[PDB]
């Protein structure tokens, strides 16, 4: 536990320690192997984003017992290339990301599983499951989206969702010119055990060549014998998951809806508008399962496996809401996050084998300023759980969509070899921590 | 080392780490006492700040040997206390930040070692004093800045500077009506052994009280033992400091000139304005002292002491230049506090029971955005080392002044106790942390 101690207007009640850390901290390392891995990406998540939702729903002395409990922590960088220059780009996408902690080298902004010059290379995920481990990989995504398309898919366009987009756009991957598929029919053919998230609609395409020709992506996924849910009844319902029988869930037919419902950020808003009150998303129907019921039953039916598994998790959606300059659903995303890693942290500590981390892709727009803050961009208003107000600001995007941001930012992690996240490092670094933590080749 | 291994085009060129961390982290692990503690922050520097700077002076796969070489870790929440209600105020000044890690408890913004009640606190400078130890204080800004003040200064508001401006701001403090007097006053009463920086405009008034009434504080100075300075070549030539001969360094009228010269950041900057390269400040004569030199001095002398010695060290021009949206400013503070930390850190290593710590008062404006970024606020492109163009936004205020942001920010630490770092933790904590290393009382 991190909370402040006590009165934190008195001396020593805004402490999160209570006494000297290196005896529990040397207990913390450990390298014998990882038997299991659960990374736990927050898409968007920088220092700015994790404070802001704390600041509003535990209060700035509390603590995500979640996102906040892991104890070995660092700074990662995640510049991306410019494809023709080969020189750093200092501001990554989703998938250029994605695509250096998932196979350990940089690329350019927009590719997936695929270097600067288009080479493909192996995602952790795939090495994993050669080794016969299982495999994981979760999202509030449309399964599409480039973060979770990151671990089975490698293509030249994050846009190629499927038969259609990949033949305008990723021409060198589309499957009737020889290539590999699009990102959807890539992630069939790679057969994690457990696949969950949004992104029905592009299973509505039909093959424009293959062994599954003119059947919808969907009909081929039941053809090669597949076990379809898509609400929480059926999903909880399914009592195993693997090579036989992969688990494909399908949620919602793009994003998966938001946790909460608050108005968008505007022009002058902390001093024209109220301060705002987030409210649980009226629209967000209860069948629909959460991030952490998903995570509940992935962990559930992979953790069978004796030799170990590999599993991704990720809150799609705090970025998009950042993008949206929309706190409330940004905030919301982020304590969906931290409910799912507190199950990733209940099942590690009592497996005791099992590296768990937590991190971003990349920073974003949304600050934490002062209430009397005039900016030119968006800003709002907002009534915390220590009953002050905390105004946010998206203030780099005359556009309509606020931007990511270039900045470094936390990671952490608990379990078997959590040691290697800590201190400055790379998103590549992350890919290599996995595959030794794992033993992987 | 933590630059990039090789290639950043290839696999596992762009990584940071040679091998697995976690013996090399268990011998990072000391819990035996600190003989000296060095603490260097760098005003206004959050993760943005430092990433900007690297990304420019040592690009984006590059290390700051100084800065970016601390092995321990984590992040810290540095919300003040609204004055009235005693809730959080997300987004603190310079004061109560300062406030906060030197006396370990929370306050208002704009106070100075002071509670929300006004009541005083001690100071981890005067608990090391009074333990027998050597203390400096050192900085770029003028002494009576925030940031040194609050080791030597008890004061309902920071802007209380000299006997003027306390008798109008703090009657409570002012000599003449009974207080401890202003803080120029305050820090003379202090007598750290090493005190070095600008402010040497508010040492011309003339004291309304007391001993020394009538003088001038500059010749309350003299007539109190302490040896003043004025450029590097007098710096340079002291041979000692101590509680007979106290060291004081005024170096300039106001805060001392920055390093590096550039344009001030624009609306549409980065698309109406070319690209802009950093070059060496015309302003800033020779015979002025760097941060690294002004330190150097002080770890010389305050190591003669067998007992041990206390230094804080302020880059605080970072934050001054984030302000004023000037970006070759900021990143110039940020190379100059990168040379200060060498220093600390190569003394460190050697003498090996010192414990060096290296952050910020709280975040700030600046961010890394795209090239092509079109954003409300000011922004600049910039070449880099890499040869590439990174653009930074200042995107918060329509005011001359760009403002603070509460994200928390890095902590990272070398030497005994520096364990209790890692983690999440307040910036209060720290107080507490560099108490127990000291063993102090
Ligand atoms: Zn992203
Ligand atoms: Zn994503
Ligand atoms: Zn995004
Ligand atoms: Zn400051
Ligand atoms: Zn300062
Ligand atoms: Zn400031």
């Known amino acids: 536990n991190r909370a402040a101690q006590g009165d934190i207007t008195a001396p020593g009640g805004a402490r999160r320690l209570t006494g000297d850390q290196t005896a529990a901290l040397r207990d913390s390392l450990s390298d014998k192997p990882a038997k299991n891995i659960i990374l736990l990406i927050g898409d968007g998540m920088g220092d700015s984003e994790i404070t802001a939702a704390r600041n509003y729903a535990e209060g700035a002395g509390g603590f995500f017992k979640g996102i906040d409990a892991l104890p070995l922590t660092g700074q990662y960088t995640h510049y991306a290339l410019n494809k023709k220059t080969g020189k750093p780009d200092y501001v990554t996408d989703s998938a250029a990301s994605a695509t250096a902690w998932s196979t350990g080298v940089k690329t350019y902004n927009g590719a997936l599983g695929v270097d600067i010059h288009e080479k493909d290379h192996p995602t952790i995920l795939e090495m994993a499951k050669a080794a016969g481990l299982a495999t994981g990989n979760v999202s509030t995504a449309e399964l599409q989206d480039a973060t979770p398309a990151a671990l089975v898919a490698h293509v030249t366009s994050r846009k190629c969702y499927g038969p259609s987009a990949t033949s305008e756009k990723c021409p060198g991957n589309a499957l009737e010119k020889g290539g590999k598929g699009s990102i959807t029919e890539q992630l069939l053919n790679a057969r994690a055990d457990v696949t969950l998230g949004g992104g029905a609609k592009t299973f509505a395409?039909?093959?424009?060549?293959?062994?599954?020709?003119?059947?919808?992506?969907?009909?081929?996924?039941?053809?090669?014998?597949?076990?379809?849910?898509?609400?929480?009844?059926?999903?909880?319902?399914?009592?195993?998951?693997?090579?036989?029988?992969?688990?494909?869930?399908?949620?919602?037919?793009?994003?998966?809806?938001?946790?909460?419902?608050?108005?968008?950020?505007?022009?002058?808003?902390?001093?024209?508008?109220?301060?705002?009150?987030?409210?649980?998303?009226?629209?967000?129907?209860?069948?629909?399962?959460?991030?952490?019921?998903?995570?509940?039953?992935?962990?559930?039916?992979?953790?069978?496996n004796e030799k170990g598994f590999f599993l991704q998790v990720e809150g799609a959606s705090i970025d998009k809401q950042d993008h949206a300059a929309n706190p409330c659903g940004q905030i919301g995303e982020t304590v969906d996050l931290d409910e799912a890693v507190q199950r990733a942290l209940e099942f590690a500590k009592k497996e005791g084998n099992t590296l768990v981390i937590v991190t971003a892709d990349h920073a974003h727009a949304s600050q934490i300023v002062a209430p009397d803050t005039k900016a030119p961009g968006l800003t709002q208003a907002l009534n915390t759980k220590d009953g002050a107000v905390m105004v946010m600001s998206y203030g780099n995007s005359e556009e309509d969509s606020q931007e990511h941001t270039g900045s470094q930012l936390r990671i952490a992690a608990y379990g078997p070899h959590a040691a290697n996240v800590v201190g400055l490092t790379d998103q590549t670094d992350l890919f290599y921590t996995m595959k030794a933590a794992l033993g992987l080749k």
């Open 205 to 304: 395409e039909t093959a424009t060549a293959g062994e599954w020709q003119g059947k919808t992506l969907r009909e081929q996924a039941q053809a090669r014998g597949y076990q379809l849910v898509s609400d929480a009844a059926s999903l909880n319902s399914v009592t195993e998951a693997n090579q036989q029988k992969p688990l494909l869930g399908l949620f919602a037919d793009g994003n998966m809806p938001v946790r909460w419902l608050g108005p968008k950020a505007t022009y002058h808003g902390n001093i024209d508008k109220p301060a705002v009150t987030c409210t649980p998303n009226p629209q967000r129907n209860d069948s629909v399962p959460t991030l952490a019921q998903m995570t509940d039953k992935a962990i559930e039916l992979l953790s069978k």
